[PDB]
Structure formats: C-alpha cells, structure tokens
Write a protein that binds this ligand. Sequence first.
Ligand code: IUM
Ligand code: ZN
Length: 113
Amino acid sequence: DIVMTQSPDSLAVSLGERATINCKSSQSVLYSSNSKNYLAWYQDKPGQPPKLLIYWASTRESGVPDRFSGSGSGTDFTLTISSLQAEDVAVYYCQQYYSTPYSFGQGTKLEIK
Ligand code: IUM
Ligand SMILES: [Zn+2]
C-alpha cells in the first residue's frame, strides 16, 4: 500500500510567520504519462468536515488564498503557509490517490504559538 508519512506531528508557529509541513510517500506518486503528482492536501478544523486545499500537489482549490502553497514531485511534498493566520489552526493531511487504496498521512496539528 502506498503509505503517507507527515512531519512534524505538531507545529506551533507564531502569527504572521511561515509554517512548513512535510509529507513523504513510500513510492513515487508522479504519473509519467500525465506528469501529474496524485497528491492532495486537506485542512481539517475541529468538529468540521475536512476541506480540500490543494490537489495535483500544487493546484489550489477555488477560494484558497495563495499564502497556502503545495510543492514537490515524486515522493517528497510540502505544504507551506506563508504568514499563518488565526483561522489556519487545524490539522493538515496529505493524501495520495495514485492507486487504490487511497491513503492519508497521520496529520500535522498546526497551532498558534
Ligand atoms: O474535524 U474533522 O474530519
Ligand atoms: Zn499573491
């Protein structure tokens, strides 16, 4: 199974500062025919359903501000929030949908320092 591993498990960043979250896939999720990374990022707020933030590893979902940026190819991916705002507090998850069963990381709890 393709296993997704996030780092760190928890991060306390100060408002206005940058938060960086890593996600590693056990095998490449970069499809050579497409040249696309089947990697997604979700933002999950307490008690709320998860919201899709970025897909194809770097494409932002409609409405998502550009301070959220996803990058990486193959096996190493990153979610960088430039200038963390109070509403950014949530657990962030990466997911691969390269091949079934689709899998997620254990999440990274992002908090205001
Ligand atoms: O808080 U919720 O998937
Ligand atoms: Zn901009």
